Amino acid sequence: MGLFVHEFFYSLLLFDLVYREETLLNVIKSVTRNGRPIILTAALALIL
Amino acid sequence: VYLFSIVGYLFFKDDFILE
Known part of the structure; x- marks a missing residue:
């Protein structure tokens, strides 16, 4: 998506390079592991 | 953020005149 392909994206590559950073990955984790059925605890309020 | x-800005230009 910049070979000859349109604008943007470049942004996407930046996002994943920073993801490849771990420590931020550790803090990122501070939101998925006990989160995989806790996206379901969102709809609690969305129903409440 | x-x-x-962009995900807004592509399908929707800001369409903003006044606050």
Whole structure:
């Protein structure tokens, strides 16, 4: 998506390079592991 | 946040005149 392909994206590559950073990955984790059925605890309020 | 600027901005130009 910049070979000859349109604008943007470049942004996407930046996002994943920073993801490849771990420590931020550790803090990122501070939101998925006990989160995989806790996206379901969102709809609690969305129903409440 | 920085991407979802664009994700809006592509399908929706800001369409802003006054606050």
